[PDB]
Structures are given as structure tokens and as C-alpha cells.
Design a protein around this ligand. Structure first.
Ligand SMILES: NC(=O)c1ccc[n+]([C@@H]2O[C@H](COP(=O)([O-])OP(=O)(O)OC[C@H]3O[C@@H](n4cnc5c(N)ncnc54)[C@H](OP(=O)(O)O)[C@@H]3O)[C@@H](O)[C@H]2O)c1
Ligand SMILES: NC(=O)c1ccc[n+]([C@@H]2O[C@H](COP(=O)([O-])OP(=O)(O)OC[C@H]3O[C@@H](n4cnc5c(N)ncnc54)[C@H](OP(=O)(O)O)[C@@H]3O)[C@@H](O)[C@H]2O)c1
Lengths: 276, 276
């Protein structure tokens, strides 16, 4: 039988690229349920699917909004095979700006989608995997869940939360045969007036500096989503997958500095200088 | 003038002990606003305050429920001095059990109180600190925000989120004169039928094992809250405070193992063996 994959957030970026990479695999090993918060956004996915000649029936789209457990449960029921071999929790939101300029609703949304939405997926799909003694869970991670980034406080909070969620689950899941892995990505190729009204002029200036620095890092280091999507495939095919896969080695040095001074002083100084 | 301190979650545990330690300081240097989600729980705080002979006016209680920005803003307005020198974000919730047995509401609450509630406090109080070029923010942290613990998936998610939140803020706040620090605590001295209905028998058994192990760690290693509260004082008086203070060195070895194998495999195996 085919490996059934269900992926969240497939309208663009990594989830879209992974869905068509799997559905178009030359071996035809995978059946992919590409889920999207809003089905009106499915056009790029189908344009990409056609461009890679995904065979008819290799790819199916479902509406699945991870903020609603009813949407999660209805998409689970639509899996005609009655099982999910590979669950990919990829749906996510960014949030950028001075902490005091972020709306309360925008903050709550990032946490609900990024964190509670993955909890909702794991509650809905983990129990069947545990009973079967098999299944693979891949979660899209970020360098921002491993080290704090200025002006990405809430986004980072959310990615760090996924690290804690997944590591805690991994400790239990070790002898169940169910494998969880984070795919740690760096940058991937996928109004000033309102921010200034909500913060001070110095923070606003630092924000500009962050943004100029971010643009340069992206221009120099953003990876193609095909390259990132393939790390998911690598994790899927490992007989004994590790908790974390890194899509690049570029941030490891910073990571090691961070990890080697538990007071946090070396990291805070080094990252302040790197960005500003 | 006195150092004005506002602390969240003062009904018991660390926040209660810190509030009276500060209010009763022999130098009478601090004016403490001890805030509590529900004022009906203030009795132990006042019993402790009397036992340490806090001078009249050294300690004041305000209702402050970090889930509501209106409650945050009304308590801020009650600070008669018009400034907060030291803000202590300590309010928190635990959540223990099999991930599939946790209510959706209980999950959302842990994140809203532990993460969005600290964001709400920082939005309300950081701007005045930044304008003044001074102020200290202390956040109660946990060993669970530094490494994942089985059956504490959502709690850990929330503590890891605070690490990401605070580290991201610290990178920006470096040149503003506003100091943020996490106080990293280990264990501190502060129905089966329903869990079994929501999970499988094997997970339920592992849960028992976790709980027996947890009880032994607590019995052997829980620190007195006076000792933990004093680390907050240490951070407050440091001229150049670090991002993190540890209340104990007991988990550093585990922390270093975790940090030295970024694949996460060594930690997951070691912690599985430690608990089970
Ligand atoms: N791109 C990078 O530089 C980078 C780096 C490290 C990690 N990552 C991670 O990669 C994942 C995918 O992002 P991309 O692939 O990089 O970026 P992307 O295009 O932002 O992908 C995110 C996907 O999540 C979906 N989504 C948002 N809210 C959702 C909800 N409530 N329910 C279901 N789906 C929802 C988005 O769709 P709608 O917009 O239609 O809601 C979009 O399809 C994210 O978890 C992101 O954090 C990205
Ligand atoms: N105790 C440990 O073993 C340990 C270890 C590491 C870190 N910590 C951290 O220490 C902090 C304090 O806990 P303790 O001091 O250890 O435990 P605690 O007695 O649980 O303290 C938590 C305080 O948070 C309050 N709280 C809960 N929801 C709130 C809300 N919505 N608004 C305002 N306050 C709220 C609680 O009051 P109500 O119950 O009345 O809401 C209580 O006063 C927590 O952040 C905890 O994670 C504890």
C-alpha cells in the first residue's frame, strides 16, 4: 500500500513544495493529503502539481484550519485509507515588529496557530499511531525556535514552544514506535506609519536596522524550498530518525555559543552585534 | 525613593515568598505591589507579611489577572508612584498528563496565562522603562523551559516559549538600560479514572512511572522558596545582570548533554532512562 501523508499549511512555501515533491515521487509510494486553511488558496498547489506531473489520485486537497478542532476532525475523517503514516505539522505564522506595537489578537493568533494548532493535530492523530506502533511525525521547525531573534519575540516564543512540545513528546514516544522529528530551517525562498505610532523613535530605528540586516541575510543565505523539502524526505526514510534535522549548518556555530554559555550573556552580545 | 516592585501571581509559592521577602527587607528599600488573579486568595500573603513584620505601606495587593489586558492596565494605573523599577513576571500554570488527555481549553489557558500574559505585562510596562532608560524585568523560568519533560508537553511548550520571548527581547534591550533576566528554577517546595478514559493503557502506565519518579525527585531535590526567592534579589542587585540565573546547578549536566548533541538523540535517550 502507499504511504499516506497528511500535511498542514500547503498553500505556499515549504508545505506546497513538500506536498508536490511527495505526490510526484517517481516511485509513486506516497498518497498526499495537502491541507490548507482556506481552499480558495489552492491554485498554486495545483499549478505546481501539474508542473511535476503528479499522477491523478496522488494528491488530494482538504480544508483544514488548525485553529479549529472541528476542522481538524473533519479532515481526519476524509482520509479514506483510515490511517496516516506520515503527519507533517507545517502550518505557521510569522509576526514581526516591536513587542509593544503588536496587536493582542495577532499575538494570540500566532500562538494558537503555531502551538495550539500542532497540539490539536497531535491529539487527533497520535492515538492511532500509538495503537498501531508506527507512524512518523514531522514538524517544521526554525532557527528562531533554537535562538532568540530581535523583533521576532512572539514568533520565536512560538517556535521555541514547538521545540519544548516535541522534545517532551519524544521522551515518551521512544518505545512506542512513533517517531517525531523537527526539521530546522534557516531562511527559505518562499506600514512604517503604524509601527512608528506604536513605539518610540529609537526602537523604530533599531527595527529598520534589523530589517536591513534581515534582507541581507535572506539575499545571501535563503535556501530553495526544494532543498528544504528534501530534508523532510531524508527524515522520513531514516530507519531511526533523530529528534532534529538541520536544513543548513550555517547557524550551528551561533547555536553552540548560545548553548555553551547558559547565562545567555555571550549569545545576547554576539547576536546584538550581528544584527546591529 | 523606594524601589517600586510589581509582581504577578502572589497568592502562593515563589511570588508570595518574594513579595514578603522584599517588603520585609531590613533596609526598607522596596515598595511592593503584590498582585493576584483573585483577591479572595490573599490571606496567606497577609499571614506571611505579618509573620515577617512587613512595615505598613511596604506591601499592597492589587487584583491582576494576566489573561485580561484591562486588568493589567487597571493595576498599572494603581501604582501611585507612576513608575515600576522592578517588574516580576511570575504568574504561571502547570499542566500534567498524556497530551491526548488534556482539554483544549486547559491547553489554551496554559499558553494564555504563561506566554500571552507575560507579553501583556511587557507591553504595558516596558515602554515606560525604555523611555526612562532604566528598569529590571525578572521572569520566573523553569528547568522545563530548557529541556523537555515527558507528560509536561504543554507546560514545557509554554516555558520554552518564555525563553524565546525573553532572549529575543534581551537582544534588543541591551543598549536601552532595561535589564531582563530569567530565574531558572528546578523543583521548589510550594482523577486516574478520567486520565485512563482519555488515553491508552500503556501511556497510562508510563504516566504512573513518570509520577513516581517525579515524587522522588521532588522529595530529594525540592528547594525552599526562601532560597529561590533570594536568587531574584541577587539578580536585582547585579549592576549588569545576565539573561539567566540558575537556582541550582543540579540540572546543568543534563542541560549540557542536551546542548552538545543538537540532533536531540542523546537527551531523548538519557531522559527516557532517567524517568522510566
Ligand atoms: N520561510 C522561512 O524563512 C522559514 C524559516 C524557518 C521555518 N519556517 C517555517 O516553515 C513553515 C512554512 O512556511 P514557508 O513554508 O516557509 O512559509 P509560509 O508560506 O508562511 O507557510 C505557512 C503555511 O501555513 C499556513 N497557515 C497559516 N495559518 C494556518 C492555519 N490557521 N491553518 C492551516 N494553515 C495555516 C499558510 O497559509 P495561509 O497564509 O493561507 O494561512 C501557509 O500555507 C512555517 O511553520 C514556518 O515557520 C519558514
Ligand atoms: N514550583 C516548582 O516546582 C517550579 C519550578 C520551576 C518554575 N516554577 C514557576 O514558579 C512560578 C510560581 O509558581 P510557584 O511559585 O512555584 O507555584 P504556584 O503556587 O503555582 O505559583 C503560581 C502563581 O501564579 C498565579 N496565577 C495563575 N493564573 C494566574 C493568572 N491568570 N493571573 C495572575 N496570576 C495567576 C497562581 O495563582 P492562582 O492559582 O490563584 O491563579 C499562583 O499565585 C510559576 O511561573 C512556575 O512555573 C515553579
Amino acid at each position: 500500500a502507499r504511504t499516506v501523508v497528511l500535511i498542514t499549511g500547503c498553500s505556499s512555501g515549504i508545505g506546497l513544495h513538500l506536498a508536490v515533491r511527495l505526490a510526484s515521487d517517481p516511485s509513486q509510494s506516497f498518497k498526499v493529503y495537502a491541507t490548507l486553511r482556506d481552499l480558495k488558496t489552492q491554485g498554486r498547489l495545483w499549478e505546481a502539481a501539474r508542473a511535476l506531473a503528479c499522477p491523478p489520485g496522488s494528491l488530494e486537497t482538504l480544508q483544514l484550519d488548525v485553529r479549529d478542532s472541528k476542522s481538524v476532525a473533519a479532515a481526519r475523517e476524509r482520509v479514506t485509507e483510515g490511517r496516516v503514516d506520515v503527519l507533517v505539522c507545517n502550518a505557521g505564522l510569522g509576526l514581526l515588529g516591536p513587542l509593544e506595537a503588536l496587536g493582542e489578537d495577532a499575538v494570540a493568533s500566532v500562538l494558537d496557530v503555531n502551538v495550539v494548532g500542532t497540539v490539536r493535530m497531535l491529539q487527533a492523530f497520535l492515538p492511532d499511531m500509538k495503537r498501531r506502533g508506527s507512524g512518523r511525525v514531522l514538524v517544521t521547525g526554525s532557527v528562531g525556535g533554537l535562538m532568540g531573534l530581535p523583533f521576532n519575540d512572539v514568533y520565536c516564543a512560538s517556535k521555541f514552544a514547538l521545540e519544548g512540545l516535541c522534545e517532551s513528546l519524544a521522551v515518551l514516544l521512544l518505545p512506542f514506535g512513533v517517531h517525531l522529528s523537527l526539521i530546522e530551517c534557516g531562511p527559505v525562498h518562499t506600514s512604517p506609519e503604524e509601527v512608528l505610532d506604536r513605539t518610540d523613535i529609537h526602537t523604530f530605528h533599531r527595527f529598520y536596522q534589523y530589517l536591513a540586516h534581515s534582507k541581507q541575510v535572506f539575499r545571501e543565505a535563503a535556501q530553495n524550498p526544494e532543498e528544504v523539502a528534501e530534508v523532510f524526505l531524508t527524515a522520513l526514510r531514516a530507519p531511526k530518525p533523530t529528534l532534529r534535522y538541520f536544513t543548513t549548518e550555517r547557524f550551528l556555530p551561533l547555536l553552540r555559543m548560545r548553548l555553551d554559555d547558559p547565562s545567555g550573556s555571550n549569545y545576547v552580545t554576539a547576536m546584538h552585534r550581528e544584527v546591529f
